[PDB]
Design a protein around this nucleic acid. Structure first.
Lengths: 46, 55, 33, 120, 109
RNA sequence: GACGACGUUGAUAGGCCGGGUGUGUAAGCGCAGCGAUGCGUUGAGCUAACCGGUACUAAUGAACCGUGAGGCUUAAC
RNA sequence: CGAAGGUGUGCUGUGAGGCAUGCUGGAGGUAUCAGAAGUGCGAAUGCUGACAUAAGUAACGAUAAAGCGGGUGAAAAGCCCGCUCGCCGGAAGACCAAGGGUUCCUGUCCAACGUUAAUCGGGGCAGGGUGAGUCGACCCCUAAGGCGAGGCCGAAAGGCGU
RNA sequence: AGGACCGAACCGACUAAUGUUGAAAAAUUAGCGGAUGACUUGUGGCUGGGGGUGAAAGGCCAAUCAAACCGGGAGAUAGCU
RNA sequence: CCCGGCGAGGGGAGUGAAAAAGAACCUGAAACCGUGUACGUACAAGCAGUGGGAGCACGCUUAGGCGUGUGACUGCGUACC
RNA sequence: GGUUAAGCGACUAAGCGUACACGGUGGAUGCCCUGGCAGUCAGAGGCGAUGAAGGACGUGCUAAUCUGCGAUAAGCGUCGG
């Protein structure tokens, strides 16, 4: 059957990528929390 | 469909009272090569009842 | 001659454990409604 | 119940048994000794020996029957040219079965089946 | 004089090996080797390896005369188990224990 | 598992021989017909497990286990 | 020259307990009298780890179908080679995308992994391999849409938009 | 010509058995409906939680829907076990 | 060095105070699972204990006793929260 | 003496229980610190277009990886110790 995850790199980057995060202030706070917590990978960007 | 109480180790060994293996205890000797083999079986060297059959 | 390998890349098997709550239907077994 | 029935089915259907025994009979004829499980021998006899009996007398019809039973012209040729003459005076019993232990992969009882002559 | 040979972390559950080990306890080594040779078990191969090694250890490191050796002691102990996973239906996972064992044979006269 | 027969002093199974039985006139060849087809040799050929045989093949000497005269006491004989 | 801790044995008190010395251990522990407690567990569909039971029990993943003779190795029903036999064939054959990411090719190895063995492997471990003016991408341009200098609104935050 | 007809792909889903620690957290097998349309499919985008979107079923909204998920208030409260 | 597949594992040898300090490494408990030895057990019914009580095995003692383990038979007796 | 007859009976252990010896699995306990926890006192309270925080990718004799650095790349100059 068709499951929920249908991968697509373009949509992944446009939805959760670094520049998507930087575009709004809430996204910028998402980066702030992740930097404060010490994540090795901030976003899905790769 | 499933036990109500844990069977003891006693019942385990009592069921395995019948699981013991039996030794062959009956190896035959070829009359020519002198090798041991199973009764009615080819020897490891290919003899049977004193005759070379395989090589 | 070539050298017996012992690096054993996959000797860290680790292994965990997981499960999933399954769906059930008790309607006919209900003693009531 | 299985009263008086004959013929092992060997965990196979009819057509697959027929094909397998045709192939195995061809192998035994060309090589004169092969190694199989003990139950597959004791069933090969019931196939291979009738072909030798058929081959004792040489005629076009008999060759066609042999070819029908074993669809290999080399096997038919060897049958009618050597095995028929070799066993002309032998009243049946052209094969030997010798138990030879157990197979490593699955502990199946092995056996050797051979023609009783093999040019000794 | 007692001579010991061991196979630690043998890849078989203790019960399966004990089935074979009980078969040669107290026997003479030649008779034990025959019994092991004509036993159709995986554990028979392992136990025969260990027994042959014990005989060789006796003959080399200790005195000699294979002719009068006996299997004085033999026992199988549980070794550490390997945890593995068998996926079952409906998203459940099960634990598989790949059991091992330690095999010990003591020969003497 | 057990149970029954048999191991060469042998019919215990296969094959083999002869029959039976089932199907229905095999292949090859000839003949007729333009041919399909018919016909004959020919009720021919083949035939699982059936019957009656036959040592041709497989049932091997070992070895293994089980013993060396069976408690005591009274009562009879 | 033997600390705590274990593992024993004796002895002693109404008890919770104490005391002695056998062994292991190898470096600590502390009469007394005061003081403070993260001060005492068998259960909470307690929590975390280990090991049981069923139990050598079920299963080993489409009922497309195999059998020989070799080779190799310590070993082969499964690896390889040959010979026949089944199965798909608008597919079970190709060719790509998406996604993956070195699985590719080659040599070694057999622990772990492969629902069996494995000598084999998409396993481990190493080395090599992807060569473009014309094929794509990038790039020229635009659709849905997004953003948007100024601007117009909105407590801020922001929204809408030339 | 046709929200024509039969019927492959394709898209669905009426029935039966099987499976129920499954080969699968809804499948398989045998049939079944439509199949030039109110058809299906690809690749982007767009609508957001008392909100969307709905040929309507309290359907669906990442195997979650009389109100998604994540984190905070928060060690909410519980004459109850 | 020996066995084994130029495996694994083990047996020795040396090192060290110590290798049941050998790398799966300080100590090494319990659950759990073996191997031996002693005794009891195949005509006997049930919370499996306790009260009496043969016999056997051993050590002390050496006739006799005592201790310990095991326990035929018998009286009584349906776990804990 | 023998022979019968009757009465009675150590001798059974496939397995199993208990005790005891000795192992294995497993990781408690004791002991120990690499790191945590709460203070006190003395500082410093910022940094960034001369490009911040956070990263990516390279750099040694290297092969990852970590650390330092930045094509002047496990580093360069100068003054002091």
């Amino acid at each position: 059957m068709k499951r929920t995850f249908q991968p697509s790199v373009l949509k992944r980057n446009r939805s959760h990528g670094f520049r998507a995060r930087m575009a709004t202030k809430n996204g910028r706070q998402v980066l702030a929390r992740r930097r404060a917590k010490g994540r090795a990978r901030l976003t899905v960007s790769k | 469909a499933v036990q109500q109480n844990k069977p003891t180790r006693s019942k385990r060994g009592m069921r395995r009272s019948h699981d013991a293996l039996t030794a062959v205890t009956s190896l035959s000797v070829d009359k020519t090569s002198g090798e041991k083999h199973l009764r009615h079986h080819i020897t490891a060297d290919g003899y049977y009842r004193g005759r070379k059959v395989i090589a | 001659a070539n050298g017996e390998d012992s690096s054993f890349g996959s000797f860290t098997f680790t292994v965990e454990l997981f499960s999933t709550p399954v769906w059930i239907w008790w309607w006919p077994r209900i003693r009531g409604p | 119940m299985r009263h008086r029935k004959s013929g092992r089915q060997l965990n196979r259907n009819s057509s697959h048994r027929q094909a397998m025994f045709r192939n195995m009979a061809g192998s035994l004829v060309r090589h004169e000794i092969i190694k199989t499980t003990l139950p597959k021998a004791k069933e090969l006899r019931r196939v291979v020996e009738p072909l030798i009996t058929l081959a004792k007398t040489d005629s076009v019809a008999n060759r066609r029957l042999a070819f029908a039973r074993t669809r290999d012209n080399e096997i038919v040729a060897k049958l009618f040219n050597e095995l028929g003459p070799r066993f002309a005076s032998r009243a049946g019993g052209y094969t030997r079965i010798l138990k030879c232990g157990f197979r490593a992969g699955d502990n199946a009882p092995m056996a050797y089946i051979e023609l009783v002559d093999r040019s000794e | 004089m007692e001579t010991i040979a061991k196979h630690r972390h043998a890849r078989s559950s203790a019960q399966k090996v004990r089935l074979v080990a009980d078969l040669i306890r107290g026997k003479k080594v030649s008779q034990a080797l025959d019994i092991l040779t004509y036993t159709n078990k995986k554990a028979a191969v392992l136990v025969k390896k260990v027994l042959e090694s014990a005989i060789a250890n006796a003959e080399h490191n200790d005195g000699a005369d294979i002719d009068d050796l006996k299997v004085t002691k033999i026992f199988v102990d549980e070794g550490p188990s390997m945890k593995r996973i068998m996926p079952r239906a409906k998203g459940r996972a099960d634990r598989i224990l790949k059991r091992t064992s330690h095999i010990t044979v003591v020969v003497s006269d």
